[PDB]
Design a protein around this ligand. Sequence first.
Ligand SMILES: Nc1ncnc2c1ncn2[C@@H]1O[C@H](COP(=O)(O)O)[C@@H](OP(=O)(O)O)[C@H]1O
Length: 256
Amino acid sequence: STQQLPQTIIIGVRKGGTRALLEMLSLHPDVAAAENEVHFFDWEEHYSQGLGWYLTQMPFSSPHQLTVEKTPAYFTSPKVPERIHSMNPTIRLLLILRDPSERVLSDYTQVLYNHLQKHKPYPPIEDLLMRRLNLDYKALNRSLYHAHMLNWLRFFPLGHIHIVDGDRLIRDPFPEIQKVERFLKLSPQINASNFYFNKTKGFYCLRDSGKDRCLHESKGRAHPQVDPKLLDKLHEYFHEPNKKFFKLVGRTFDWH
Ligand SMILES: Nc1ncnc2c1ncn2[C@@H]1O[C@H](COP(=O)(O)O)[C@@H](OP(=O)(O)O)[C@H]1O
């Protein structure tokens, strides 16, 4: 066993289901996953240390294993594509995407939770979204998939960026995971019996080697109720950006 630079990276999107994807992929015997978000290419304190530092953060892997890490920030970080390209132009990238409006709500809910833990006030999402639609709200920008995808496609062939349907992963993960295995040239080792639905959790959980487990409590939070009129501004806001994205990647998703 040795440390190797990652042959694939889960690059985002933030709140798209990056942890679920990593854990599920790690069920494969030929996959070695970094346990934590590495934040190599996006944090200057990390990137300035060089690829040698990145290598030290990698899991140890056997000769027939792929090494993977997930850092959700990469996708929406302008500087990151060029840096990854510098490390490895032929790398295979995984991008997991959810409905952009739902992703916005997921993003808000996490930041709300962060504030609650610190006993700090945080405004209802309506306050952040409206001002007309508030275009200064950073979570909106992270859902502009077309805009960010353009930066990546300058450096990487579309064929080397596999898009995981995050909505479908939540509903029925196995078929999505099968496509990831194929994309990565992995043998189809994962099976439907590796997944079981937990009604208490409200999400699918993982079964392997006799051990059963659901994702961390921070994964799968209830979203707030939103003024319907505001939700409609939200859906409308993304309607055209979605069209542009569908044409860019040659694929449509069942989004609002
Ligand atoms: N099996 C699973 N268990 C829990 N959450 C899952 C899941 N599969 C997908 N997810 C999604 O992963 C999201 C978090 O993504 P990330 O790890 O990138 O932050 C969750 O967002 P929500 O908490 O809004 O429901 C949830 O929707």
